Structures are given as C-alpha cells and as structure tokens.
Amino acid sequence: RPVPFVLSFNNLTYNVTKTLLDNISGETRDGEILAVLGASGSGKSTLIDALANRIAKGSLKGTVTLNGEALQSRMLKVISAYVMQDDLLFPMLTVEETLMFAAEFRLPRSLPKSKKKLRVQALIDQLGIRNAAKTIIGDEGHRGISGGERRRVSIGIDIIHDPIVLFLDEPTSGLDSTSAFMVVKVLKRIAESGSIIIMSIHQPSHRVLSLLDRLIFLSRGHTVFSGSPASLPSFFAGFGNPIPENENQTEFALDLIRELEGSAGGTRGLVEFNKKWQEMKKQSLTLKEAISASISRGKLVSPAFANPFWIEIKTLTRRSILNSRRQPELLGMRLATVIVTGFILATVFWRLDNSPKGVQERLGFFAFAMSTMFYTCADALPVFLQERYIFMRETAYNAYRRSSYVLSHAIVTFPSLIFLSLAFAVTTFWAVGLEGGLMGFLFYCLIILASFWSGSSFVTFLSGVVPHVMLGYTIVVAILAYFLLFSGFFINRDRIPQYWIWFHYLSLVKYPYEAVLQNEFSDPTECFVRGVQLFDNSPLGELTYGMKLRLLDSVSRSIGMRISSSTCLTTGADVLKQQGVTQLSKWNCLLITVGFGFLFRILFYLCLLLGSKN
Amino acid sequence: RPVPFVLSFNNLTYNVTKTLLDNISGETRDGEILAVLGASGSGKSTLIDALANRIAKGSLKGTVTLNGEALQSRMLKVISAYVMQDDLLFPMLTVEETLMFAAEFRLPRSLPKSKKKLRVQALIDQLGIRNAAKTIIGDEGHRGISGGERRRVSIGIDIIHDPIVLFLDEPTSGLDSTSAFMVVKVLKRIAESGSIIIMSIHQPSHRVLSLLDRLIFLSRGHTVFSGSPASLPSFFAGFGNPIPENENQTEFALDLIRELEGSAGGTRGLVEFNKKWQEMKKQSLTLKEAISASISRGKLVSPAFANPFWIEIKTLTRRSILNSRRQPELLGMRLATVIVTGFILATVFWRLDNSPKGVQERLGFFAFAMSTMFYTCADALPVFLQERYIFMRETAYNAYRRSSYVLSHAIVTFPSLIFLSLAFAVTTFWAVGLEGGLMGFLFYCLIILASFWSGSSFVTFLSGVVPHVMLGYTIVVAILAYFLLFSGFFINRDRIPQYWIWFHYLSLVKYPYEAVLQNEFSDPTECFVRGVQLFDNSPLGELTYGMKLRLLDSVSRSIGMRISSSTCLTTGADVLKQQGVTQLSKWNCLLITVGFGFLFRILFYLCLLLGSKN
Incomplete structure (x- = not known):
C-alpha cells in the first residue's frame, strides 16, 4: 500500500x-x-x-x-534525514512548540500554518507523546519530560519533512x-x-x-x-x-x-x-x-532555505524571547551583579568632592564601572555554548542561515542590555555625583549600553572559538583584565612602551573609560584646584592660610600674572591632559565602542563559517 | 564450606x-x-x-x-560496606595503586605491607581486571581502562576489608x-x-x-x-x-x-x-x-581510624604528588598565566622612573601584580571540587580524618606555589626595577608566596561551600574584584566611608598590596620630587628652569627655610602618607596575609564538619 x-x-x-x-x-x-x-x-x-x-x-x-x-x-x-546521537533541544519550549519551530524552519512557507499545524499534530500521534504535548522539555534543573521521551522529540524534529530514507546514529x-x-x-x-x-x-x-x-x-x-x-x-x-x-x-x-x-x-x-x-x-x-x-x-x-532571511530572524527571535521568558533567573543573575555592583560602587564612591583625591577616585570609579559591563556579560558562556550546538545541528538541515543566526542572536540580547544599562546608570550617577546634569546622564546611559554591547559581542565571539565553558572563562577573565591594564587607568597612553601601544589601541575597555572621562571632566565652571589649593600635598603645602597668600602673591611677582584664591588653576580640561585622554572625542570613543561590538559579530560569523564547514 | x-x-x-x-x-x-x-x-x-x-x-x-x-x-x-552509585576515582593512579591506597587507609597497620600487597593481589584476581592492573584509570581526556572496568575498581575499593554483607546501590x-x-x-x-x-x-x-x-x-x-x-x-x-x-x-x-x-x-x-x-x-x-x-x-x-594522623598525611600526600606528576598540564596552566602575566607586567611597566607618574604606575603595578596571585589559584576549582566528592566517599569508611585531609591538601599545593612565586618575582623585579636590592627581593618573593597561599586557601574554602565549578567561579571573580576595589588602590583607606570600612579591613588584597608598597617606598635616599620638580603638573609647571630657582627662592623667603634644587621634598615615606599606607608594617601586612590563609583553612575544616554530617 x-x-x-x-x-x-x-x-x-x-x-x-x-x-x-x-x-x-x-x-x-x-x-x-x-x-x-x-x-x-x-x-x-x-x-x-x-x-x-x-x-x-x-x-x-x-x-x-x-x-x-x-x-x-x-x-x-x-x-533523507540524519539523526545525530544527541538530544540538543532547548530546555524550555514544551513539545508542541519545539516541533512547531522545526516546522516553520524546514517545511516550506507556501504551506499555510493550518496544514503545518496538523503535520505537527500527525507527527505528535505517530510519535508516542501525547502526555508530553503540553509539558516543558525540561533539562536537569527544571524536570519536565522523560529521558527516553526526549529522544522521540529529537528524532521527531528530523522527521518534520517526512523523509523516505531515515539514517539514525544510535537512537537508543x-x-x-x-x-x-x-x-x-x-x-x-x-x-x-x-x-x-x-x-x-x-x-x-x-x-x-x-x-x-x-x-x-x-x-x-x-x-x-x-x-x-x-x-x-x-x-x-x-x-x-x-x-x-x-x-x-x-x-x-x-x-x-x-x-x-x-x-x-x-x-x-x-x-x-x-x-x-x-x-x-x-x-x-x-x-x-x-x-x-x-x-x-x-x-x-518539503529551495536552498525554506524562508527568506527576514522570517528566519523573527522565528529565531520568538524562539529565544520565549525560552528566556520561561527561565527568568538568567536575567536575575546578570541583574543581581549589576544592582549589587551598582549599589557597592555608589556607596563607596558616595558623593565625591572636587579634591585631588576625589579626581583620582573618579578615574578609579570609571575604570571599575566600565569593566563591570564586560564581566557581567561573561556569565552567558553557559547559554552561548548551549546553542551553537543546536545551531550546528539545525544548519545540517538548512533550517536557517548563519547570517540570519548572528543577526537574531544580537537582537534578543539587546532588550536585556538596555535594562541592565539603566539599572547601573540610575544607581551610580546621582549617588557618585557625576557631572553633566541630564545630557551627561544620557551619555552615561549610552556608553554603559555600548559597553554591554561590545562586551557581550566579545564573549559571543569567544563562544565560537572555545570548546567548553570553563576554558572560555579563564581566558575571558584573563583578557578583560589585560584590557583593563591597557585602558589608560593603570598606566597612561603616553607612558605605555612602543612595543605595547598596538594593544593599548586594541583594548575594549580603553574607549568606554575614555568616554566617561570626557563626559565628566569637560565643564569649564567646575574647578578641582582653586588658588590656595596649589600647595596641598607637597612638603611645601602643610602651611596655614596666612602665609599661603604671601606665598601666592610672590608667585604673581615672578611671571607677570596675578594669582589669587579665586583663580581656578586646574579645571576638568587639565585633568584630561594629565591622563593623556586627548586623542578622541567622547562620541568617537562611543563610536569605537559600538564598532568593536560589530567587529566581534562579523568575526563571530566567520568562525561559524569555518567551524561548521570543517 | x-x-x-x-x-x-x-x-x-x-x-x-x-x-x-x-x-x-x-x-x-x-x-x-x-x-x-x-x-x-x-x-x-x-x-x-x-x-x-x-x-x-x-x-x-x-x-x-x-x-x-x-x-x-x-x-x-x-x-559491611555500602557501594554508592558513582565511580569517583582519581583519573591517574593505575589500578594496582588505587586499590593499594585504599588498602593502607582502611586495612589496619598491624598488618605488614607484605600481607597487604597480596590482599590487593587476591582482590585483583577476584575482580576480573588483570589486563588493567598496570593501566591508568583514565578520565575522559586521558583514557586508560574501560567504563565497566572502572566499576569493578570502585566496587573493589569497598571490598578492601572483605566484608560479609555488601550493600550496593545500583552497581550496574x-x-x-x-x-x-x-x-x-x-x-x-x-x-x-x-x-x-x-x-x-x-x-x-x-x-x-x-x-x-x-x-x-x-x-x-x-x-x-x-x-x-x-x-x-x-x-x-x-x-x-x-x-x-x-x-x-x-x-x-x-x-x-x-x-x-x-x-x-x-x-x-x-x-x-x-x-x-x-x-x-x-x-x-x-x-x-x-x-x-x-x-x-x-x-x-580489618579502632576508629586504622592509622594515626601522621601516616594519613603522608598517604594523602603521596597520593596527590603522584596524581599531579602524571598530569603536568595543571602546573602548565597555572604557570602559563604567571610567566605570561609576569612577562606582560614587566614589559609594560619596564624600568619605571622616579616621576610623579611613575609613582602612580608603581601602585598600579603592585595592585595588578598582587591580584594575579588570587586569580591564578582560582583555576583549581575543577580539581578542588574533583576531590571532596572523593573525600566524602572515603570518610564514610573512616579512611582518614577530615583534619588530616585539610593538612594534607595544604601541604601538597605548597611546592607548586613556591615555584609560581619565584617565577613571578624573578620576571617582575629587575625589569620593573623595584627597590630594595636583595633583602627587598626576598620580601617580594615572600609576599608573592603568601598571597598565593592566601588566595589558594580562599578558593579551597569556597570549594566546600559551592556545589559546582561554574557558580564557584563567577563569585570568585566577583569577590576578588571587590577585594581589589577595597585594597586601597581605587579609593584610599581614609576616604572609604564608615559603613564600608569593615570590608576594607576584611580584604585579602589589602594586606599584600600594602606590603609591597612599604617594601618599595621605604628608602631615605630615593627621591621622587627634587626641588624644582615642585611645579610640574599645575599651571605652575610649564615654566622655564632659569627663573624657577628664584620662584623657589621666593618660597624660601616666605617660610624661613631654604629650598634649592637639591632639597628632596617628596621621599618614599611621603608617598605612603599620601596613600594612607601607615597603619601596619610590612611584616605585619605579611602576617595578616598568612593569617588569612590559615583562617580559610580552619573555616574550610568547619564546612567539612557541617556538609558531611548533613
């Protein structure tokens, strides 16, 4: 028959x-x-x-x-269809949706979803899973279906187009x-x-x-x-x-x-x-x-792909804003290290003054703040190496393009980066007492979000050149500590030797740290040394206020200028020249922060071009 | 019969x-x-x-x-003997030695080893493993015996005393x-x-x-x-x-x-x-x-334990200086982040001068150096949670005491900490140009080794309150970054608020960082500001030298002293008063560095007292 x-x-x-x-x-x-x-x-x-x-x-x-x-x-x-010896599925996404995502990827779009819905309903009865048609797949922490009943789902994904010859590599x-x-x-x-x-x-x-x-x-x-x-x-x-x-x-x-x-x-x-x-x-x-x-x-x-690249993007987005909705303890661990670090940094550096020590505490706040953006995104190497083993399985069947996978994986992290970036910028701006008012608050929000964007693009690029999570974490902390050493905080730009200046400019922490400095220390009215603050922390400088003005009027008797206790010696523009932060504007330091985000997503696509072809 | x-x-x-x-x-x-x-x-x-x-x-x-x-x-x-449902063995230690370590732990010491060597030889024939009597147990990366021939060894460990009734929880x-x-x-x-x-x-x-x-x-x-x-x-x-x-x-x-x-x-x-x-x-x-x-x-x-505590220490030492010889890529990853970080830190900070910027680069070198000691030891959370699952199995049989396990696990890391501590101190002392000569080199060797000892004791204490490696690494990097923020480098001790001063003093990076500062900045002959270096980086400071002497002679006609270009204003003792590093000597900062190592090994023993009684 x-x-x-x-x-x-x-x-x-x-x-x-x-x-x-x-x-x-x-x-x-x-x-x-x-x-x-x-x-x-x-x-x-x-x-x-x-x-x-x-x-x-x-x-x-x-x-x-x-x-x-x-x-x-x-x-x-x-x-035909080759069924690999794994069950690489998303841990959420109940088994009517796992097979309906694999339906829209792989069945052609000339079919309506009405016929496509009953093809999954025919397959869900041909498989012995109707008790599990409405239960989560359920990995080791969120137990939802059986072990040998996951196997009929991963087998069932590959029979979504109903092939004739069906190769299975140890399905039991x-x-x-x-x-x-x-x-x-x-x-x-x-x-x-x-x-x-x-x-x-x-x-x-x-x-x-x-x-x-x-x-x-x-x-x-x-x-x-x-x-x-x-x-x-x-x-x-x-x-x-x-x-x-x-x-x-x-x-x-x-x-x-x-x-x-x-x-x-x-x-x-x-x-x-x-x-x-x-x-x-x-x-x-x-x-x-x-x-x-x-x-x-x-x-x-069941064309090379069954969809154009603007429907594979909204299918991969809907699959990952639904897998991440159903476990909101991933954005409760990347958010309890931003609220917690934002509460710690805003209470240590609470309301810093215009002092020679409060200037050096701003550079220490801005270097510890702008490195939190790169470490917080390092706690996604579990989930970034959880897919790209599901991507490598689903591109053997031509379910989606690799260009359409990077563009969909960059999109869905971005609404969770906007909320982490204004949870760190609401906490640590009015408490630390940063300068700018409101147009200097929006730039602080922008450069936190652009450092989350290039710090999550850097670790999605490494997740794609590393084989496992633990190796791709001891070299994430090691590189983002050498990015911080070369940011210009520990040693300034014009004191880094000539053989290390190539890695100063390749530092991902250099450009957001130099952008919050020009956002803070560019105000002509704010003064950090005022007249008789010239002699503070030298042995000349433990004097009293009486002889300081004779000491200050005598300096005026040597150059031709007139220096008083209202002369405003060191402004914020001279703090930046003392640090060497003079080469780029704050918007060009925001451009290179975004442009290093897009670089490690083009370099991520090329490592999907190599590691999947080989 | x-x-x-x-x-x-x-x-x-x-x-x-x-x-x-x-x-x-x-x-x-x-x-x-x-x-x-x-x-x-x-x-x-x-x-x-x-x-x-x-x-x-x-x-x-x-x-x-x-x-x-x-x-x-x-x-x-x-x-009796209860055989748990695992195979928790050391990956090295060929199966004549795995059962001979379990022999000397559990068989009584009134037996000679002559009878004890043939009890293992009787057991290795009763078990079906004679092809595997001279091959390594062989974990997933260094395979040496079968999967079902590991099971007869973990079963065989529990029959080292040859019990009558033998309970096995799923042995197949x-x-x-x-x-x-x-x-x-x-x-x-x-x-x-x-x-x-x-x-x-x-x-x-x-x-x-x-x-x-x-x-x-x-x-x-x-x-x-x-x-x-x-x-x-x-x-x-x-x-x-x-x-x-x-x-x-x-x-x-x-x-x-x-x-x-x-x-x-x-x-x-x-x-x-x-x-x-x-x-x-x-x-x-x-x-x-x-x-x-x-x-x-x-x-x-087959007494509460079959050995006094001075033979359980040398049996646990010989078991772990033999498991670590047979995989020398654990001391090739903790040594390729000390030679590599030592080569990077000694070429960025190559031969720092006695300048106001070279002083701030020494504090940035000493804070990045003394935090390497605490991160390098964080790459042992794989192996520190590899045992304490073997310790929890072997203390159900009373093989060794828990006091004798901490004292043996602290001993065997220490010859590998002495070699990491003089690989970082040979690289970054004569290249950075640190001060002290030779008695200030030996203190630099001492406080590197005491920060390796304190930072390997802290992460062996966390490995013992955490369930897995990946959770006990994102809170190792998070705590050792808040230890660095409170060390006195980012914000000084007398500028930390009163509600955060309890965590300044509880910081593990505070005491070695303050010990290398008093080792470096305590020399009465070295001078960091000399007379006409008073006006360098103020609006006074783009002057010419020819008038600077009468700019400095006019200072001398205002206090009553006489200042010249050979006055030596800022010594190294005034760099420490500007940082607040004045509360403890460098040896008392070396004592508290060692005394925090011993604290997280007494607190580790108490978490072996709780989690095993549970």
Missing part, C-alpha cells in the same frame, strides 16, 4: 591510509528496519555517515543505489530498556508507512527484535552477518558456534564477535563464510514518479 | 510524614545475591539505605536480624549489557565466598539472571514479588498475567508493575497476593564466633 523503495548499497570502500570500510554490500526495503551492529566503534557509524554522504566524495568508492538506479547528494538531502543510546523499546516501536511505526530506516543499534534488547527486520554485523570494516534475525540462530549454528535457546539473541552473536578480537582468533574466518552464506538463498523504475507517488501518499512535505 | 550467615529484615517501616517504606520483610543467605527491583524510585534504594542504617534511627521501625540475633550500627560498620548503572554482566559475575564470585550481597539493580538483562538467587520487587514501599527468579514465571501466571516464553523475564514482570501505576489499576491488587503466596511455600548460632570462624576463613581483614 505504500510506494515500494529499494536502497541497495554495494562495494563500499572508505579509506582515510586506513581503509576504515572494505566491501560492504547491502539491500533495504521500506517497511523494514536495517540495523547495523558493531562492537565499540567497528564502523557501524561511518557506515551511516557513508550512506548519508557525510564524509567525502573521492575518499569513498562504491555505487549507492536507490530503486535500481544511481544516487547523488542532491536527491539524498531532500529525501543512554536509554533504559523499556523506553528504548518505544523508540524503536515508533520507528517501525514510521517504517510501517513508506519509510526506509537504516539505524545503528548498540547492543539491542530482547523485546526490540520483534521490529528489526534485517541486520548487518561489522568487524572493522568487514561484514560478518547480514540477514534477518530469524536466520541468526541458523547462521551461527552452521558456522561452528551454536546458539543457546531461551536466551537473548543478537547479544550472544555480538560478544562472540568480541571474543574473536584476540591475538590469533580473528573474524577473518567469518568474512568468507559470510560470502558463502549469501549464495545459498537465491531460491527465487523511474524513482521520481515513485517519489511523486510517495508525495501523494502523504510523505515529503 | 564458608561460614553460613543469614540476614533477615522484618516489618521495616520508614517514615519521613511520607511513609516511604512500610512492612518490608525478607531473608538472605550467604552464597546468594538478593536483588531489589523497582521502577524509577520505588524504594529500591532507601531500602539499601535502610538496611545499612544510613538514614535515621527512630524514623525507621523494624527489627533487622543477622544469624537470628539483633543487629546494631556498631557491628554493621565493621562487617551506566554500563553496557556485556560489561555489566561481568560486574555481576564477579559479584557472585565474591558471593561464592562467605559473602551476603544485597544490591538494587535497575532493569537487569537476560544473561544476568543465572546469578541472582533471590528477588524483591517494590511498588512505592510495598513488596510485590519476593522469591527466586525460577519462581517468577510461576508467580505471575497464578496472579492472572502469564509470562511469554523466549522473552526476557524480570523485564516483562517489571514493566507490568509500571503498567499498574495508572489512575485506577493500582499495585494494591498485588500486595495481598504477595501475602498469600508466601503462605503456600512452607512445605519444609552465636554470631560473634560465626564472625570469628569467618575471619579464619580469610575474610574480615
């Missing part, structure tokens, strides 16, 4: 030299489940990777055939033996429609072999047994190792392979008996209209 | 109220394996915790009986079905000696029921089936649900238990049939000399 398909791979030789696979031939129908078995890395996978064309063309030789005719990689990516690994049965029970329920399934089971159970209809055993790139599980007693009995009854088949037959991994035993005594066993059982058409008949059966619901 | 033991628990009611267990009766022999089965938390464990007295006395009611005699917790800790979880067979094969080989084994399997295989001799099934604290696995077809057939042949028993009979966890099915229809099935099968000695006869058989090789 389905349309009959025949996949028949032949003479596969995969070399890398290594000769990792050597002369594997096979045949599969629909209705059946071809299971490929191996011991611990025998080549069970790298045969699933070889039949899905996921290795190389040229390093594999051998005709892969479907319906008795040749097969190229253009047809096997609209017709890490599952208990009674939920791994219902995985293979719904897999044959998929295969009871017009579907070919080539999966690589690691050590099947006993109740599962009511479903597997054809087996292949591999010993380091050589086939050892190839046939039905009913012929599995009759094969091993005729080889010289009979089978114990009332005992689990396909386990006795599999560790007997492993005992022949000895020094002189060898499975080479099995590879030519496998060649003589095939000879004794010979007892005795335009696939694109067979595909077109199998589209009209109801399969193959 | 062994000494016959019986264990016979009766009428166990465990309440917490909850009534987690009620009226569980049973009986076990030596020679046999009692397996307790349940679905997903039925009470299979917390019956193993109930029979090992590992929950509460008073919240458990019911007599636990051995050899027809009562049993108390003093006897079941010399006679996370194992493939053919290495989990050899776990239960060596368990019955242990049980073929005079050993009682009460283990709680999760969904056993088919080839394993040749080894289990008695079963107990639990449904939310109620026994359901209790008997041999041979009687497991005959029980369910007489209940009303017959068994399919050529199919795995104890899996059919266990998912049928989960089927009766429905809305109106209930396993209460099984609990009184379990009361009538026990009635139909009744067709039909001085324990402490039975133990004494079972010592002379060769069991019970």
Whole structure:
C-alpha cells in the first residue's frame, strides 16, 4: 500500500591510509528496519555517515543505489534525514512548540500554518507523546519530560519533512530498556508507512527484535552477518558456534564477535563464510514518479532555505524571547551583579568632592564601572555554548542561515542590555555625583549600553572559538583584565612602551573609560584646584592660610600674572591632559565602542563559517 | 564450606510524614545475591539505605536480624560496606595503586605491607581486571581502562576489608549489557565466598539472571514479588498475567508493575497476593564466633581510624604528588598565566622612573601584580571540587580524618606555589626595577608566596561551600574584584566611608598590596620630587628652569627655610602618607596575609564538619 523503495548499497570502500570500510554490500526495503551492529566503534557509524554522504566524495568508492538506479547528494538531502546521537533541544519550549519551530524552519512557507499545524499534530500521534504535548522539555534543573521521551522529540524534529530514507546514529543510546523499546516501536511505526530506516543499534534488547527486520554485523570494516534475525540462530549454528535457546539473541552473536578480537582468533574466518552464506538463498523504475507517488501518499512535505532571511530572524527571535521568558533567573543573575555592583560602587564612591583625591577616585570609579559591563556579560558562556550546538545541528538541515543566526542572536540580547544599562546608570550617577546634569546622564546611559554591547559581542565571539565553558572563562577573565591594564587607568597612553601601544589601541575597555572621562571632566565652571589649593600635598603645602597668600602673591611677582584664591588653576580640561585622554572625542570613543561590538559579530560569523564547514 | 550467615529484615517501616517504606520483610543467605527491583524510585534504594542504617534511627521501625540475633550500627560498620552509585576515582593512579591506597587507609597497620600487597593481589584476581592492573584509570581526556572496568575498581575499593554483607546501590548503572554482566559475575564470585550481597539493580538483562538467587520487587514501599527468579514465571501466571516464553523475564514482570501505576489499576491488587503466596511455600548460632570462624576463613581483614594522623598525611600526600606528576598540564596552566602575566607586567611597566607618574604606575603595578596571585589559584576549582566528592566517599569508611585531609591538601599545593612565586618575582623585579636590592627581593618573593597561599586557601574554602565549578567561579571573580576595589588602590583607606570600612579591613588584597608598597617606598635616599620638580603638573609647571630657582627662592623667603634644587621634598615615606599606607608594617601586612590563609583553612575544616554530617 505504500510506494515500494529499494536502497541497495554495494562495494563500499572508505579509506582515510586506513581503509576504515572494505566491501560492504547491502539491500533495504521500506517497511523494514536495517540495523547495523558493531562492537565499540567497528564502523557501524561511518557506515551511516557513508550512506548519508557525510564524509567525502573521492575518499569513498562504491555505487549507492536507490530503486535500481544511481544516487547523488542532491536527491539524498531532500529525501533523507540524519539523526545525530544527541538530544540538543532547548530546555524550555514544551513539545508542541519545539516541533512547531522545526516546522516553520524546514517545511516550506507556501504551506499555510493550518496544514503545518496538523503535520505537527500527525507527527505528535505517530510519535508516542501525547502526555508530553503540553509539558516543558525540561533539562536537569527544571524536570519536565522523560529521558527516553526526549529522544522521540529529537528524532521527531528530523522527521518534520517526512523523509523516505531515515539514517539514525544510535537512537537508543543512554536509554533504559523499556523506553528504548518505544523508540524503536515508533520507528517501525514510521517504517510501517513508506519509510526506509537504516539505524545503528548498540547492543539491542530482547523485546526490540520483534521490529528489526534485517541486520548487518561489522568487524572493522568487514561484514560478518547480514540477514534477518530469524536466520541468526541458523547462521551461527552452521558456522561452528551454536546458539543457546531461551536466551537473548543478537547479544550472544555480538560478544562472540568480541571474543574473536584476540591475538590469533580473528573474524577473518567469518568474512568468507559470510560470502558463502549469501549464495545459498537465491531460491527465487523511474524513482521520481515513485517519489511523486510517495508525495501523494502523504510523505515529503518539503529551495536552498525554506524562508527568506527576514522570517528566519523573527522565528529565531520568538524562539529565544520565549525560552528566556520561561527561565527568568538568567536575567536575575546578570541583574543581581549589576544592582549589587551598582549599589557597592555608589556607596563607596558616595558623593565625591572636587579634591585631588576625589579626581583620582573618579578615574578609579570609571575604570571599575566600565569593566563591570564586560564581566557581567561573561556569565552567558553557559547559554552561548548551549546553542551553537543546536545551531550546528539545525544548519545540517538548512533550517536557517548563519547570517540570519548572528543577526537574531544580537537582537534578543539587546532588550536585556538596555535594562541592565539603566539599572547601573540610575544607581551610580546621582549617588557618585557625576557631572553633566541630564545630557551627561544620557551619555552615561549610552556608553554603559555600548559597553554591554561590545562586551557581550566579545564573549559571543569567544563562544565560537572555545570548546567548553570553563576554558572560555579563564581566558575571558584573563583578557578583560589585560584590557583593563591597557585602558589608560593603570598606566597612561603616553607612558605605555612602543612595543605595547598596538594593544593599548586594541583594548575594549580603553574607549568606554575614555568616554566617561570626557563626559565628566569637560565643564569649564567646575574647578578641582582653586588658588590656595596649589600647595596641598607637597612638603611645601602643610602651611596655614596666612602665609599661603604671601606665598601666592610672590608667585604673581615672578611671571607677570596675578594669582589669587579665586583663580581656578586646574579645571576638568587639565585633568584630561594629565591622563593623556586627548586623542578622541567622547562620541568617537562611543563610536569605537559600538564598532568593536560589530567587529566581534562579523568575526563571530566567520568562525561559524569555518567551524561548521570543517 | 564458608561460614553460613543469614540476614533477615522484618516489618521495616520508614517514615519521613511520607511513609516511604512500610512492612518490608525478607531473608538472605550467604552464597546468594538478593536483588531489589523497582521502577524509577520505588524504594529500591532507601531500602539499601535502610538496611545499612544510613538514614535515621527512630524514623525507621523494624527489627533487622543477622544469624537470628539483633543487629546494631556498631557491628554493621565493621562487617559491611555500602557501594554508592558513582565511580569517583582519581583519573591517574593505575589500578594496582588505587586499590593499594585504599588498602593502607582502611586495612589496619598491624598488618605488614607484605600481607597487604597480596590482599590487593587476591582482590585483583577476584575482580576480573588483570589486563588493567598496570593501566591508568583514565578520565575522559586521558583514557586508560574501560567504563565497566572502572566499576569493578570502585566496587573493589569497598571490598578492601572483605566484608560479609555488601550493600550496593545500583552497581550496574551506566554500563553496557556485556560489561555489566561481568560486574555481576564477579559479584557472585565474591558471593561464592562467605559473602551476603544485597544490591538494587535497575532493569537487569537476560544473561544476568543465572546469578541472582533471590528477588524483591517494590511498588512505592510495598513488596510485590519476593522469591527466586525460577519462581517468577510461576508467580505471575497464578496472579492472572502469564509470562511469554523466549522473552526476557524480570523485564516483562517489571514493566507490568509500571503498567499498574495508572489512575485506577493500582499495585494494591498485588500486595495481598504477595501475602498469600508466601503462605503456600512452607512445605519444609552465636554470631560473634560465626564472625570469628569467618575471619579464619580469610575474610574480615580489618579502632576508629586504622592509622594515626601522621601516616594519613603522608598517604594523602603521596597520593596527590603522584596524581599531579602524571598530569603536568595543571602546573602548565597555572604557570602559563604567571610567566605570561609576569612577562606582560614587566614589559609594560619596564624600568619605571622616579616621576610623579611613575609613582602612580608603581601602585598600579603592585595592585595588578598582587591580584594575579588570587586569580591564578582560582583555576583549581575543577580539581578542588574533583576531590571532596572523593573525600566524602572515603570518610564514610573512616579512611582518614577530615583534619588530616585539610593538612594534607595544604601541604601538597605548597611546592607548586613556591615555584609560581619565584617565577613571578624573578620576571617582575629587575625589569620593573623595584627597590630594595636583595633583602627587598626576598620580601617580594615572600609576599608573592603568601598571597598565593592566601588566595589558594580562599578558593579551597569556597570549594566546600559551592556545589559546582561554574557558580564557584563567577563569585570568585566577583569577590576578588571587590577585594581589589577595597585594597586601597581605587579609593584610599581614609576616604572609604564608615559603613564600608569593615570590608576594607576584611580584604585579602589589602594586606599584600600594602606590603609591597612599604617594601618599595621605604628608602631615605630615593627621591621622587627634587626641588624644582615642585611645579610640574599645575599651571605652575610649564615654566622655564632659569627663573624657577628664584620662584623657589621666593618660597624660601616666605617660610624661613631654604629650598634649592637639591632639597628632596617628596621621599618614599611621603608617598605612603599620601596613600594612607601607615597603619601596619610590612611584616605585619605579611602576617595578616598568612593569617588569612590559615583562617580559610580552619573555616574550610568547619564546612567539612557541617556538609558531611548533613
């Protein structure tokens, strides 16, 4: 009643030299489940990777055939689906929405959402999940569905377009033996429609072999047994190792392979008996209209991408402002280190005066404040490396572009950066007593938000060159401490040596720290040294007010000027010349702060161009 | 041929109220394996915790009986061993040494090591590991033995004293079905000696029921089936649900238990049939000399602790200076952030002059240098939380004291802190051009080592109040940044407000930063402002030198002193009074740096006193 398909791979030789696979031939129908078995890395996978064309063309030789005719990689990516050995899903997003996000990414948009809603409703019944249709997927801290019932969802994402041939790389690994049965029970329920399934089971159970209809055993790139599980007693009995009854088949037959991994035993005594066993059982058409008949059966619901790049952006935004709504303790940890640091910094540096020490306390406030923006965003390396393992899975199916992923991941962090930036700028502006009034408050809000923007762009760029969270945190703290050393606070710009001046200008803390200094120390009325404050902290300077004016009028008798106690010697424009903060305006220091944000999002896109292509 | 033991628990009611267990009766022999089965938390464990007295006395009611005699917790800790559901071993330490460290901790020291070396040799043959007797245990990055051959070592650690009754909490979880067979094969080989084994399997295989001799099934604290696995077809057939042949028993009979966890099915229809099935099968000695006869058989090789506290210190030292030699990339990451930061800090701050800016660059060097000591030791939170999960396992068996664990963990870090402290002090002393000569170099070496010691003691104290590495790193960087803000570098001591002065004095960076300042700025010959350097960076200060002497002679005609270009106004003793660094000597700032190291190792011992008694 389905349309009959025949996949028949032949003479596969995969070399890398290594000769990792050597002369594997096979045949599969629909209705059946071809299971490929191996011991611990025998080549069970790298045969699933070889039949899905996921290795190389040229390093594999051998005709892969479907319906008795040749097969190229253009047809096997609209017709097939490879299910990786993971469950990389978002921890929120209940399982009607996980499969509806994967619906709109991958099913074409010429379909209405009305037909697309029942395709997910057909799939949610074909899978054995209706108790979990309204419950959260639920990672280790927010438990919401079962472990082997997550597996039918990640399997179900890849069958959103209802493929014909379905490659699965160990779909029952890490599952208990009674939920791994219902995985293979719904897999044959998929295969009871017009579907070919080539999966690589690691050590099947006993109740599962009511479903597997054809087996292949591999010993380091050589086939050892190839046939039905009913012929599995009759094969091993005729080889010289009979089978114990009332005992689990396909386990006795599999560790007997492993005992022949000895020094002189060898499975080479099995590879030519496998060649003589095939000879004794010979007892005795335009696939694109067979595909077109199998589209009209109801399969193959699925262009390079199924959406333009302005619908993949609002699908990836809606998916991540809904995954982040349902756990508001990520913006309760990036906000309880901004309110907490904003309360500490505003009460230590409470109402700083116009003193020579209060000037040096402003530079110490502005360097500790403008480094909080770069550390606060470092507490997203858990979630930034949580996706890009989901992105690397979803771009194998061409669900969205990599350009459309960076532009959507930059957008959704930005409403949570505006609220962190005016929670630090409301706390530490009227308490520290910063200068500017209101147009100098809005610049303080702007440069906090632009330092959150380039500090979250820098650590989303590193999350994309690092493999794990803990390595990409001890070099986030190490780089953002060398960015602070070179900001011009610890050592000024004109005192940094010539061989280190390239890294002064490449510092991400240099440009916001120099922007809050010109926002604060540019006021012609504010005076930090007034006349008889000239002699304060030198040995000349512990005098009294009486002889200070004779000391000050005598200086007036030496240059030709007239200096009094109302002369306003050191303004705010001379504080900046003492620090070397004279090369750029505060808006050009706000431009380079934003322009280093956009640099690590173009450099992030190029590391998605390399690490996903390789 | 062994000494016959019986264990016979009766009428166990465990309440917490909850009534987690009620009226569980049973009986076990030596020679046999009692397996307790349940679905997903039925009470299979917390019956193993109930029979090992590992929950509460008073919240458990019911007599636990051995050899027809009562049993108390003093006897079941010399006679028994509880095997937790983990494999927490050191990743190095090949398996002849892992079991020989557990030998010397737990076997008594009146034994010579000659008998103790063959007790490990008898155990390594009783276990099925002789191919792995000379290979490293091998964690995920440095693989050396199998996944199921780690399980026989962690099981083997707890049988180092060769107990009689052996409780195992899921000893075959996370194992493939053919290495989990050899776990239960060596368990019955242990049980073929005079050993009682009460283990709680999760969904056993088919080839394993040749080894289990008695079963107990639990449904939310109620026994359901209790008997041999041979009687497991005959029980369910007489209940009303017959068994399919050529199919795995104890899996059919266990998912049928989960089927009766429905809305109106209930396993209460099984609990009184379990009361009538026990009635139909009744067709039909001085324990402490039975133990004494079972010592002379060769069991019970095993005082509160088996060693005084000066041999537990050198056993824990030899175990960790051998685990750390075999991975010298832990002291190649704490040393490539000290040579790298030492090379960066010594080339930015290369040869600082006696200038008003070079004085402020010394305080910025000394505050960035003395904070490197506290961050470099923060890259040990992976390994500090790697043990204290091995310590919490090994103090259930009284292998070592918790006082003897802190004193041994402080000792072995100290030869790696001396080498990091003179790699930072050789790099950044003659390049930055620090003052003191040679007796001011040895103090620079001392206060770097005392800040490594204080900052490795602070993060070993937090590793002991935090549950995981990633939480105990974003609050290590956050606290050691607020320690740096309050050190007196960003805001001075006499400018910190009165409500924040308690945290200035509690700052761990305050005392080494103030110790390198008095080591540097205490020299009566070094001068930072000389006579006509009085007017440098004021509006007075863009003058010419030719008139500056009469600008300075006019000062001399205003106080009564005589100032010239050789007066030496600002020495190093006046730099310290301008910073407020006047309250303690440099040795009393070195004492409090060491005394905060010893405080977070006494506070670490108290958090091992709380979290382990919990």
